[PDB]
Amino acid sequence: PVNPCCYYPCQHQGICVRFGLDRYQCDCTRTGYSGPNCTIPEIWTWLRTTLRPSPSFIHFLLTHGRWLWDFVNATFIRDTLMRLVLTVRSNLIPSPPTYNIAHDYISWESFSNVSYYTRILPSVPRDCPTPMGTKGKKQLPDAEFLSRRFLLRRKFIPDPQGTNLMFAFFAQHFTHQFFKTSGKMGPGFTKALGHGVDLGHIYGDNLERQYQLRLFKDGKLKYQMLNGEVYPPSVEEAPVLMHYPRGIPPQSQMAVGQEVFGLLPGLMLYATIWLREHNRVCDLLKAEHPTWGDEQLFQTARLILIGETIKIVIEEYVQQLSGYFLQLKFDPELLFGAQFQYRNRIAMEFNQLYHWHPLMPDSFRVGPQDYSYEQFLFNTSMLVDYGVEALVDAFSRQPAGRIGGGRNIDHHILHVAVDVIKESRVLRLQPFNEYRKRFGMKPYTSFQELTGEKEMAAELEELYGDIDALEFYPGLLLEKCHPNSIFGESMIEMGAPFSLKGLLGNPICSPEYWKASTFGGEVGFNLVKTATLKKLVCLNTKTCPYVSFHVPD
Amino acid sequence: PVNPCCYYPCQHQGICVRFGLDRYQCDCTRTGYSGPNCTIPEIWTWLRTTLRPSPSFIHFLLTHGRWLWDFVNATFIRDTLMRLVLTVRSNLIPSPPTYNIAHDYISWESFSNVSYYTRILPSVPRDCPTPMGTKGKKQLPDAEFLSRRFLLRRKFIPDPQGTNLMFAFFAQHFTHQFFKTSGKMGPGFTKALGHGVDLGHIYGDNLERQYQLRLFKDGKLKYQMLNGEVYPPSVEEAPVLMHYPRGIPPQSQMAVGQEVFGLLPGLMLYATIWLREHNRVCDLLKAEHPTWGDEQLFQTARLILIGETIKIVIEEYVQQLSGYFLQLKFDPELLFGAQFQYRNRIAMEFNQLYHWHPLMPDSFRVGPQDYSYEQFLFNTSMLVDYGVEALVDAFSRQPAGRIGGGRNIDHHILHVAVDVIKESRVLRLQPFNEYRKRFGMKPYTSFQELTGEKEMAAELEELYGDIDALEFYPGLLLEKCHPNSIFGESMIEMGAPFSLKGLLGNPICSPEYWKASTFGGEVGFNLVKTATLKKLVCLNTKTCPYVSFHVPD
Ligand SMILES: *[C@@H]1O[C@H](CO)[C@@H](O[C@@H]2O[C@H](CO)[C@@H](O[C@@H]3O[C@H](CO)[C@@H](O[C@@H]4O[C@H](CO)[C@@H](O[C@H]5O[C@H](CO)[C@@H](O)[C@H](O)[C@@H]5O)[C@H](O)[C@@H]4O)[C@H](O)[C@@H]3O)[C@H](O)[C@H]2NC(C)=O)[C@H](O)[C@H]1NC(C)=O
Ligand code: HEM
Ligand code: HEM
Ligand SMILES: *[C@@H]1O[C@H](CO)[C@@H](O[C@@H]2O[C@H](CO)[C@@H](O)[C@H](O)[C@H]2NC(C)=O)[C@H](O)[C@H]1NC(C)=O
Ligand SMILES: *[C@@H]1O[C@H](CO)[C@@H](O[C@H]2O[C@H](CO)[C@@H](O)[C@H](O)[C@H]2NC(C)=O)[C@H](O)[C@H]1NC(C)=O
Ligand SMILES: *[C@H]1O[C@H](CO)[C@@H](O[C@@H]2O[C@H](CO)[C@@H](O)[C@H](O)[C@H]2NC(C)=O)[C@H](O)[C@H]1NC(C)=O
Ligand SMILES: CCCCCCCCO[C@@H]1O[C@H](CO)[C@@H](O)[C@H](O)[C@H]1O
Ligand SMILES: CCCCCCCCO[C@@H]1O[C@H](CO)[C@@H](O)[C@H](O)[C@H]1O
Ligand SMILES: CCCCCCCCO[C@@H]1O[C@H](CO)[C@@H](O)[C@H](O)[C@H]1O
Ligand SMILES: CCCCCCCCO[C@@H]1O[C@H](CO)[C@@H](O)[C@H](O)[C@H]1O
Ligand SMILES: C[C@H](C(=O)O)c1ccc(-c2ccccc2)c(F)c1
Ligand SMILES: C[C@H](C(=O)O)c1ccc(-c2ccccc2)c(F)c1
């Protein structure tokens, strides 16, 4: 007989378990539903469904009416809604984590082995009639053809929200601490064992690397003085594994936490900033505690930087991304009266979701100059040539592309998106519509409804066959955006649960850790509480340039 | 200059932080106290501490008045009290974890590096006057002499609670899955990376060792047949590292999850029983799931055995140990309306505390025979000679030694108690009375108050000089026992928070995991819900012997 779990019969987070030769069962425990497929609502669930307004309506509320949002932000209601946003989003994410690439069920190996990426939905069973489950054709559309006809940028479509490259290089820098897909272990495995905001892109994913980057004096990391400016040390000074083109002199090579950060001047930009901040923090701690050893000066500074990161990510990064009129607030105290797990494991779907390559432009403007991909990529001198001030100013001024909408990835880095779809099929991700149902959305009934247009939608119908066969990453990028927004509903409704759970899931946000002593008295605590992007750059640079996640207009 | 944090100035879980040259500050955050030293109580704390009865009063209520308890056990008050027991006890344990041997302060390294045991109180700073802080003598009492004069058994004292050897072997077996101090890394480090009831003493501490034990057919572990009965295989069959005496060849050995288990027949007994159980569980699962592969059968059986372990420990093991009239209950659902982190880090203090070597008798009786320590230790054939049925009957009939009170450790295994004291001084553990205040108890004002008698008290007062200089492990064993109890209050009041946090902190007790599907349906879920020590033995044997955690009348 055929595998019945290929039909995804279990609704609203119910678990499909195969019993006997030809039967199956759904485990509807705490799903809010009863019945063989978990489609029969309990009194409380029915009372919530016909009173829950559509995700588009709630977006509309958050993006309109400046007058009432000014009132809300200046009252207690700011905290109420921030607590509401945090809980409701994160409660979609299983914690402790549930499945992985090896196991489409709960196991001890899935809990303990942190080298795995986790998954919210199980993979499409290996014995299903069609690659995506039961719907569609026996062979999925060509990955290269799909990227060429639907993802390749014709003309540059700029982001309507005013997102800049300063955001884009932050987005890449920040995420590369919890996205480190293994080379030797293959797909579904991660080198980033911290599984979140651990700053292993600054300190490293292991102790051997960390010790090698540390100066072991005053808690600082090693550095070099070039033209009177502070930069990460050379590989000769800090002998760590760094990915560079075979030939580049070791004098030009810079040693940082993440191995791929020397490839782009934008990545090595922030790496330099955070390094300068770390030592600046250490100087504030050594004054406060002159009896403190190097190790305490180091570890305490790290936690401050971790706190600063989450502060800026929530209140500035996610703020610009969402375009919400609600002034987002980083306050761990909000979740102290609630049932919240202070742990996090990175999901593969989040890894797939965060591929925001449409952000990258056609070229890179630095003042009167205009640098192409073949001038900007692997360039080692640029960062030192222009300096931190001059580059931050240029990245904060240049607009980034629109993520959603489709056909917005520059031809250079299109190969990446091709791999993402190929990787998706190795991982055996479920269809787009099943992830829609998992995140409390209605599945798309037609290809028309996904893209919101006639032409590109009708072409996909011919290639996929059935809408319930549309793939995870294509669906996300092909979906119509919100009125004047950077992407569609799915990117918000699916990404936020992963995102906010990752931020507030950090142990520093727990009642046990969120104390003044953790950060070395009140000084270190205020450093977290009052951190800003503007403060992160200018308190570490000679002059103060234009710095923001949005273009100046 | 003298370090102010040596004076332990911050009371009620206040964190001492060294500011400037010789100044200190207490971090009185969410402790319920304010002021310079966290002694000024908040409105609710004052109310809460004046109304709170002594631990000795609560002990009395739980151990007296059968008529009241028969009523309580038959009503929902059973569930009401057990939830209070669970939540109130385990809240005394910091989670996420706090300190280790490296850091006497909150750090990311302490959080992420699972090789470390955690600790509740920080160490005694190295720049203090006396090794125990400020109080006591410059040179601490001799570890060898201290165990000789106070801990050495003269005449055997049986436990008045009726605890048998079956309990003591379960205790040692059960504990060695989360107590595995890395002899090569040093004290404070652990090989048991699951940090709790992960069954790393049945399936090994690492992945490669697990696979060597696994038969890879029907989810079962490898096994050899002797006398028609099921036993763990040899190292020839399953090539894994086993700590055997020099000269004993691998073919004469038996392969299990814990390396040290070959050294004692009692440890090797339970290893056999749980292995028999796993394969027995696999048989039931295979009938219900013929489509299931090997991996899922093994992983699911493991979870079922984890659930079985926690059930028996709570409802029988802790029941016997406590001797409470309240019928204890394992139901994770009691915590589903509570703030509870489902994670556990094994403490170094919990290690020190669990060295229950007094339990071991003068000799070992197996029916008509009486084996000495030399005859019993490192024995290879005894298990195979008698069988499981016979030795279960044997250990369940012979009384185990009373833990507390003092002077009840056999000379053969007395060298352990010595090493524990010497390990504590390496670990720079805080005084006994400092842990008393840490676990809601009054510090002892004298040694006479600690012991109840007068002779031992006088010489301890001579050797230590001060009661506040007394060490953790000597203090736990020499303390007066509750009338007709196995040990004193400090073993309960300090040990209960660790063990209950360890048991319920297991991810299977979370709302996400605690589902029937996790255990392959209702069949596996019931096995967990109806687990017994009796059922663990007599469902894996041909005949059922006397099996209990206590002796017969
Ligand atoms: C959890 O925490 C444990 C720490 O308690 C971790 O175990 C420890 O791991 C460290 C490093 O991995 C081991 O190193 C020891 O620390 C000494 C510090 O002084 C160290 O001396 C220095 O070693 C440097 C290398 O790390 C060395 O620099 C040289 O590096 C290269 C050669 O390695 C070359 O490029 C050059 O020769 C450099 O000079 C420097 O010169 C010093 O000699 C020494 O190596 C020590 O061995 C610890 O042994 C170890 N502690 C233990 C086992 O107790 C553990 O890994 C953590 N767990 C996880 C999962 O991360
Ligand atoms: C033009 C600059 C960029 C280059 C050259 C680049 C390069 C790459 C490549 C080649 C991969 C896949 C590795 C493979 O071949 O298998 C990758 C992965 C990834 N990309 Fe980019 N990328 C760029 C921009 C960005 C930006 C701006 C973001 C925004 C967050 C981003 C997000 C990611 C993420 C999250 C991954 C997964 C990390 C991992 O490999 O584990 N990329 N990048
Ligand atoms: C006659 C049987 C026993 C023998 C021969 C014995 C001896 C030993 C030895 C040699 C060790 C390893 C070295 C050490 O840590 O001291 C050890 C560890 C330990 N034992 Fe026992 N003991 C016995 C009974 C018990 C009992 C009844 C308990 C109660 C649970 C117990 C609990 C422990 C604990 C908690 C450890 C520490 C584990 C570690 O960190 O390695 N032992 N014992
Ligand atoms: C890397 O980038 C640097 C920018 O600092 C490049 O140097 C500039 O190159 C342009 C031509 O593209 C010249 O017109 C400028 O005069 C150069 N500026 C400076 C300050 O030297 C450099 O060519 C790039 N390197 C590589 C290998 O592509
Ligand atoms: C539960 O989900 C299954 C998905 O397979 C539904 O399908 C079943 O019922 C259909 C209509 O009666 C039949 O045509 C299918 O053959 C049958 N599928 C199987 C595997 O037996 C089923 O209707 C759903 N049940 C309810 C109550 O809605
Ligand atoms: C957890 O992740 C994987 C599980 O597949 C482990 O890697 C495998 O280990 C086994 C036994 O050692 C090998 O046979 C496989 O070849 C390995 N697969 C790989 C490397 O892809 C890994 O060892 C585990 N990690 C930890 C920390 O337990
Ligand atoms: C622009 C098209 C008009 C449709 C009005 C949608 C506004 C959403 O209104 C929603 O109505 C639902 C009832 O259907 C309720 O359950 C929601 O709580 C309510 O807000
Ligand atoms: C004015 C009130 C709107 C602000 C409250 C935001 C509620 C949190 O956002 C909610 O996230 C859930 C989890 O993904 C989704 O299922 C909901 O549709 C979404 O609105
Ligand atoms: C009728 C007796 C049952 C009362 C339920 C109390 C169980 C909580 O246990 C309590 O833990 C406290 C914190 O660890 C200790 O200080 C108390 O002495 C202990 O009884
Ligand atoms: C209402 C609780 C306040 C009394 C706590 C006093 C501490 C006395 O302690 C307890 O007193 C009990 C009195 O019944 C005795 O039976 C116990 O053995 C004794 O330890
Ligand atoms: C606060 C707001 C909300 O939860 O709706 C929100 C939170 C997080 C994201 C977000 C989505 C994907 C990657 C990174 C962040 C997002 F797009 C919107
Ligand atoms: C239920 C009871 C209580 O909390 O008081 C209780 C719970 C756990 C222990 C216990 C103490 C030390 C090691 C193992 C178990 C104990 F001794 C008593």
Token pair of A180 as six digits:
């480190």
Q: What residue's CA is closest to ligand 5, atom 17?
A: A4
- Cα–Cα distance for residue pair A489/A483, rounded to 1 Å: 11
Architecture of domain B2-42: Ribbon (2.10)
Alpha carbon distance A219, A384 (integer Å): 25
Give the three-class secondary structure for A336. coil
How distant, in Å, are the alpha carbons of A102, A105, A110, B296 from that of A98?
A: 12, 7, 7, 14
Quote the ligand 5 centre to A7 CA distance (angstroms): 9
- Long-range CB pairs of B441-445, under 8 A, 24+ apart, other chains included: B441/B55, B441/B489, B441/B490, B441/B493, B443/B467, B443/B468, B444/B470
Phi, psi of B214 (to 5 degrees): -75, 135
Cβ neighbors of B113 (< 8 A, separation 6 or more) are A207, B100
Q: Which residues of B touch A342 (CB under 8 A)?
A: 96, 341
Please report residues of B whose CB lies closer than 8 A to that of A106: 303, 513, 517-518
Helices (H), A113-206: 143-150, 165-175
Angle at A422 between CA A416 and CA A424, to 5 degrees: 105
Which of B131, B158, B156 shows the shortest CA–CA distance to B421? Answer: B131
CA B214: distance to chain centroid? 27
Distance CA A17, CA B429 (A): 50
Distance in angstroms (rounded) separating the CA atoms of residues B243 and B240: 10
Beta strands in A220-347 (DSSP E): 224-226, 229-231
**B277 in A contact zone (CB under 8 Å):** no
Counts of helices then strands in chain A (DSSP H, E): 23, 10
Report whether the peptide linkage leading into residue B96 is cis, meaning its omega lies within 30 degrees of zero. yes
In b/e form, how buried is each residue of A2-21, taking b as 16+ CB within 10 angstroms? ebbbbbbbbbbbbbbbbbee
Residue-range domain boundaries for chain A: 2-42, 43-552
CB-based contact A473:A352 (threshold 8 Å): yes
Q: Is A324 a catalytic residue?
A: no
Q: Is A379 in the pocket of ligand 4 (CB under 6 A)?
A: yes
DSSP-based three-state secondary structure for A438: helix
Where in the sequence numbering do the catalytic residues of B fall? Answer: 176, 354
Q: On the CB side of B405, how many CA atoms lie within 13 Å of its CA?
A: 24
Helix pair A55-62, A489-505: axis angle to 10 deg: 70
Q: CB of B26 within 8 A of CB of B54? A: no
Question: Residue B30: how many CA atoms within 13 Å on its side-chain side?
Answer: 14
Residue of A25, A98, A99, A107 best to disrupt the B interface, most CBs of B under 10 A: A107
Q: What tokens does B84 get?
A: 């209070």
The alpha carbon of residue A144 and the mean position of all alpha carbons in its chain are separated, in whole angstroms, by 25
Pairwise CA distance, residues A252 & B390, whole Å: 74
Enclosing H/E stretch for B212? helix B207-213
H-state helical runs in A32-101: 43-49, 55-62, 66-73, 77-90
| Candidate from A87, A352, A499, A501 with most ligand 11 atoms within 8 A of CB, to mutate | A499
Q: How far apart are CA B252 and CA B183, in angstroms?
A: 25
Q: For residue A541, give the amino acid letter.
A: T
CA angle (B336 as vertex; A76, B317 as ends), nearest 5 = 145
> Residue A268 CA to chain centroid, in angstroms?
19
| Residue from A437, A479, A440 nearest A457 by CA | A479
Are the C-beta atoms of residues B116 and B190 closer than 8 Å to each other? Answer: yes
Closest chain A C-alpha to B288 CA, distance in angstroms? 6
Distance from C-alpha of A17 to C-alpha of A31, rounded to nearest angstrom: 15
At the top level of CATH, the class of B43-552 is mainly alpha
For residue B114, the Cα-to-chain-centroid distance in whole angstroms is 18
Distance, CA of A172 to CA of A170 (rounded, Å) = 5
- Crossing angle (nearest 10°) for helices B165-175 and B388-395: 110
Distance A211 CA to ligand 2 centre (A): 27
Q: Give the number of the ligand closest to the Cα of residue A367.
A: 4
Method used to determine the 3D structure: X-ray
Which residues does B148 contact at the CB level (< 8 Å), separation at least 6?
none
CB contact under 8 A, A296 and B194: no
- The residues, any chain, with a CB within 8 Å of residue A428's CB and separated by 6 or more, are A123, A124, A126
Q: How many angstroms separate the most distant Cα atoms in chain A?
A: 74
- Please give the Cα distance from B253 to B200 (Å, whole number): 19
Side-chain half-sphere exposure of A389, counting CA atoms within 13 A: 10
- Tokens 């290879």 label which residue? B380
**Chain B within 8 Å of A287 (Cβ-Cβ)?**
no
Which regions of A207-292 does DSSP assign to beta strands (E)? 224-226, 229-231
| Contact yes or no for B541/A124 (Cβ under 8 A) | no
Beta bridge partners of residue A399, listed in sequence order:
A164
Q: What is the CA B459 to chain-centroid distance, rounded?
A: 30
Angle between helices A267-288 and A521-529 (to 10 degrees): 150
Instruction: Test B108 with A518 for CB contact under 8 angstroms.
Output: no
- Closest residue of B to A14, CA-based? B517
- Determine the 3-state secondary structure of B22 from DSSP: coil
Find the residues whose C-beta lies inside 6 A of ligand 9: B 55, 58, 61-62, 81, 84-85, 88-89, 92, 440, 493, 497
Element (H, E) at B40: strand B40-41
What is the Cα–Cα distance from B264 to B271, expressed in whole angstroms? 11
The residue whose CA is least distant from atom 13 of ligand 12 is B495
**Residue whose tokens read 């709302």:** B511
Task: Select from B506, B77, B13 the least CA-distant residue to B305.
Answer: B506
* Residues A487/A495, Cβ–Cβ less than 8 Å: no
Q: What SS3 class is residue B163?
A: strand
Q: Which of B385, B402, B473 is nearest to B432 (CA)?
A: B473
Number of Cβ within a 10 Å radius of residue A339: 14
DSSP B238-262: S-------TT--GGGS---SSGGGG
| Alpha helix stretches (DSSP H) within A117-180 | 143-150, 165-175
B3: nearest Cα among B24, B27, B33: B24
Q: Which residue is listed with tokens 């399953």?
A: B238
Q: Nearest to residue A94, comparing CAs of A86, A106, A82?
A: A106
- Asked if A482 is an active-site residue, the reply is no
DSSP symbol at A61: H
Chosen from B113, B297, B517 to mutate, greatest number of chain A CBs within 10 A: B517
Is A402 within 8 Å of A358 (Cβ atoms)?
A: yes
Strands (E), A134-248: 224-226, 229-231
Contact: B517, A113; criterion CB under 8 Å: no
Q: Which residue has the tokens 């996205």?
A: A179
Ligand 4: residue whose CA is nearest its atom 24: A375
Was B103 annotated as part of a binding site? no
What is the three-state SS of B342-366?
A: CCCCCEHHHHHHCCCHHHCCCCEEE
Geometric angle at alpha carbon A45, from A44 and A51, rounded to 5° = 95
Among chain B residues, CA nearest to A200: B108
Q: Quick count: other Cβ atoms within 10 Å of Cβ B321?
A: 25
- Distance, in Å, from the CA atom of B216 to the CA atom of B222, rounded to the nearest integer, reads 8
